[PDB]
Design a protein around this ligand. Structure first.
Ligand code: ASC
Ligand code: ASC
Ligand code: ASC
Ligand code: ASC
Ligand code: ASC
Ligand code: NA
Ligand code: NA
Ligand code: NA
Ligand code: NA
Ligand code: NA
Ligand code: NA
Ligand code: NA
Ligand code: NA
Length: 207
């Protein structure tokens, strides 16, 4: 599957793509404002994520740090990124269908649109100004708006028992972005697409 990753932000981002225990395609790349990076994701990839990272520094070996979404210090990510991260999530070729969503379960750093470029389903979007509106106790100094699980590490926020409800904090993310997961047991906002669809992830879509 083809994913075109487009940075419409005014600022540089470092895109990342992983399934948790491996890179997808090269795993990461710099995108200056306006740049597009096209990757290939293997069919059948389960549990893939794409995200942006902000305020990164890398040396010539591709090691360094980002203020949001750092993945073990690597330019090419192999693992998931440090919150806060707005997440484009996908599982491809699962019994004939693809499943896409946007999540704020790991917080929010950059606004996002995640849409198919082929026919048969609709896209999803979280483009509200979550960072500017973020509750004081969730604000990350690095940039971004942390989820409550990251901040407080409770069973209720992290839904560790598989028993949890919405919270004051999850409802904030839900109010600003109804079409994204706000907590682990949120009513799903997953979209079912035809198997082997292709996609575009746009950072800062309203920019
Ligand atoms: O880091 C980058 O890589 C590409 C190009 O320079 C070679 O792939 C690009 O446009 C970036 O900002
Ligand atoms: O116009 C500009 O381009 C770069 C950056 O935004 C590219 O992403 C920068 O720092 C500017 O002031
Ligand atoms: O893969 C996972 O992603 C979400 C969350 O961590 C980010 O949305 C979750 O609950 C998983 O088990
Ligand atoms: O495995 C996942 O779990 C959550 C959600 O679907 C249920 O918590 C999510 O965002 C994932 O990628
Ligand atoms: O039937 C198919 O659709 C996709 C692609 O063509 C996008 O539509 C693909 O890889 C197929 O085999
Ligand atoms: Na891949
Ligand atoms: Na295939
Ligand atoms: Na992101
Ligand atoms: Na990183
Ligand atoms: Na507030
Ligand atoms: Na199909
Ligand atoms: Na298909
Ligand atoms: Na936007």
């Amino acid at each position: 599957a083809t994913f075109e990753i487009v940075n419409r932000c005014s600022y540089t981002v470092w895109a990342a793509a992983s399934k948790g225990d491996a890179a997808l395609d090269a795993g990461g790349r710099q995108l200056n404002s306006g740049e597009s990076w096209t990757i290939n994701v293997e069919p059948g990839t389960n549990g893939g994520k794409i995200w942006a990272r902000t305020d990164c520094y890398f040396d010539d070996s591709g090691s360094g740090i980002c203020k949001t979404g750092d993945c073990g210090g690597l330019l090419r990510c192999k693992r998931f990124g440090r919150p806060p991260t707005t997440l484009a999530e996908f599982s491809l070729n699962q019994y004939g269908k693809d499943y896409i969503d946007i999540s704020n379960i790991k917080g929010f750093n950059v606004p996002m649109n995640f849409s198919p470029t082929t026919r048969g389903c609709r896209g999803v979007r979280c483009a509200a100004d979550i960072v500017g509106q973020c509750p004081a106790k969730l604000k990350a100094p690095g940039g971004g708006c942390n989820d409550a699980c990251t901040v407080f590490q409770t069973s209720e926020y992290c839904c560790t028992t598989g028993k949890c409800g919405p919270t004051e904090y999850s409802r904030f993310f839900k109010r600003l972005c109804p079409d994204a997961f706000s907590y682990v047991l949120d009513k799903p906002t997953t979209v079912t697409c035809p198997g082997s669809s292709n996609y575009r992830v746009t950072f800062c879509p309203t920019a």
